[PDB]
Amino acid sequence: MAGLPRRIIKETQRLLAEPVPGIKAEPDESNARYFHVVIAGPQDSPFEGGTFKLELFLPEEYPMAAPKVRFMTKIYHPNVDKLGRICLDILKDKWSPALQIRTVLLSIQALLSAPNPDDPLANDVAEQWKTNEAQAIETARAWTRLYAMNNI
Amino acid sequence: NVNVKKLLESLNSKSLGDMDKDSELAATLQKMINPSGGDGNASGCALHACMAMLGYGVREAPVPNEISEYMTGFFHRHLEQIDSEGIVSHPNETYSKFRERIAENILQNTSKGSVVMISIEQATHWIAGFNDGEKIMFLDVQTGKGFNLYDPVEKSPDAFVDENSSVQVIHVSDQEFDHYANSSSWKSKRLC
């Protein structure tokens, strides 16, 4: 009930007013800790033209607890599993109270423009991406048309 | 390799203003402490500005996935000096009127050529403060600007400060500075 006030207020006000280019967001009516974020699939990326939904949850001790983010929209990505779980380091081990939400949001949007190989977790998509890149793209492009478009 | 306060005069006495020579130096250092940057490594970039103004030298600042190396501890520690409501802009107060008013919990509680970590909106953002003796120099070095309140574009001298804008100045021990120069995180950062 006693935390780091100014920062959460200011970080939120920024997310719903002064947000990162290509990222908009609307807070959840029920819980004020959950944010309904929307990221636009970048250009020259397989997701171009798609608007993906992400769930942003700010835990109890947010600054001292990495925030929780996940794709609520399906997507063929070597770094996002079937459940929507993103595989970003600054969300896992490498998270610090010194990093803000923008850091994570930016990181994710960067990941769409250019997926990451250096990924220890086992994933079929990943496998197809690094070998059959050609087809893998074709497929992401089609999933962006199915799940990431007309999805609102 | 114009390292150390060598060009500390090359970017100080000219036809440039006070709030003007800031964005000056920072823009230089930025090119060394944050080769093309703009993410969340603010905290790291600022700790490095103090590092250069304290003499230790300029080293590429830590990037997002390296912040936890040391920064998570610095926070660990100085947290009470951050969860403070610190200085707060008054209604209608301008950017210069606030930068000057802030250069007090500095100029006063200062030293010969000492530095400080300035927290913006309680860890929302960071900038480094340097006391040259008579005035103060605020350096962002992450986006290479002078004093600002996490603004994409450096704001005009007489723009209005948003309501309730707050900055907590962080007094940083010289030991803390020596502790970081003796840390692996620091020694592993690319020099210059």
Curated annotation (Swiss-Prot), chain A:
Residues at the active site: C87
Task: Explain the regulation of its activity.
Answer: Activity is inhibited by binding to OTUB1, which prevents 'Lys-63'-linked polyubiquitination. Activity is inhibited by GPS2, leading to prevent 'Lys-63'-linked polyubiquitination.
Q: Which SMART domains match?
A: UBCc (SM00212)
Gene Ontology cellular-component terms for this entry are: cytoplasm; cytosol; extracellular exosome; nucleoplasm; nucleus; protein-containing complex; UBC13-MMS2 complex; ubiquitin conjugating enzyme complex
Where the protein is mainly located, per its record? Answer: nucleus
Query: Which keywords belong to this entry?
Result: Acetylation, ATP-binding, Cytoplasm, Disulfide bond, DNA damage, DNA repair, Isopeptide bond, Nucleotide-binding, Nucleus, Transferase, Ubl conjugation, Ubl conjugation pathway
Modification sites for N6-acetyllysine: K82
What do we know about how this protein assembles, alone or with others?
Heterodimer with UBE2V2. Interacts (UBE2V2-UBE2N heterodimer) with the E3 ligase STUB1 (via the U-box domain); the complex has a specific 'Lys-63'-linked polyubiquitination activity. Interacts with RNF8 and RNF168. Interacts with RNF11. Interacts with the E3 ligases, HLTF and SHPRH; the interactions promote the 'Lys-63'-linked polyubiquitination of PCNA upon genotoxic stress and lead to DNA repair. Interacts with ARIH2 (via RING-type 2). Interacts with OTUB1; leading to inhibit E2-conjugating activity. Interacts with GPS2; leading to inhibit E2-conjugating activity.
Name of the protein in question:
Ubiquitin-conjugating enzyme E2 N
